[PDB]
């Protein structure tokens, strides 16, 4: 998904 989280996701 292009609208999914594009940043670091630690959890």
């Amino acid at each position: 998904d292009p609208n999914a989280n594009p940043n670091v996701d630690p959890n």
Partner: antibody
Amino acid sequence: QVQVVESGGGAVQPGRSLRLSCAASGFTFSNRGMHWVRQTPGKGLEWVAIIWYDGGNKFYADSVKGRFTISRDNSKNTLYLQMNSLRDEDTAVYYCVRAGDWKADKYTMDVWGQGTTVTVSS
Amino acid sequence: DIQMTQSPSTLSASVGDRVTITCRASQSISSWLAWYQQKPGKAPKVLIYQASSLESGVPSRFSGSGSGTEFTLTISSLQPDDFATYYCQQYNSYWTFGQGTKVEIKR
């Protein structure tokens, strides 16, 4: 301050290429997705491309597919936009925009740079 | 592709007036609507995300409402610094913007 600064815009002949850069400061650039967005008075704000924090996932608007390429150098805190086969309708102010990190199912953009102007012209 | 439509395109108001800007989506975007403020020659700044969440540092006179296909940006008491163009944006499928609403100030 969270800050992004575009560079590289200028006059470019139709059919030629130009590379834009975006210098990031005031935040951890390596941990954020990044966008390119462009603006014109008529067609308004048009999203161009996005790149994941690690430089892997990339998505492009159909208007620039096959001609524009987004990339990034996390060690230099820089975002790039390689623009090939430029046309008259590519003239715009080009903004580099940081992805917002608000916890949710969907994601967008928060902080914009001052912009750099690309003028396709002979 | 989802098209966003704003109304009105331009509005004139006095300091202290309540300003209401509307934004309509061509299909349901749930609450995935952001509002931005742009001054001439300047970059847009985010005001509201998730239709109603106020970003840090944004004055409380800016309020966002709506869901599905109809959304509203409300300025409770217009200030001189609120002279700007305001853009809505859906982030349900990629990112598309409305055409913008210019707010001019009578004095």
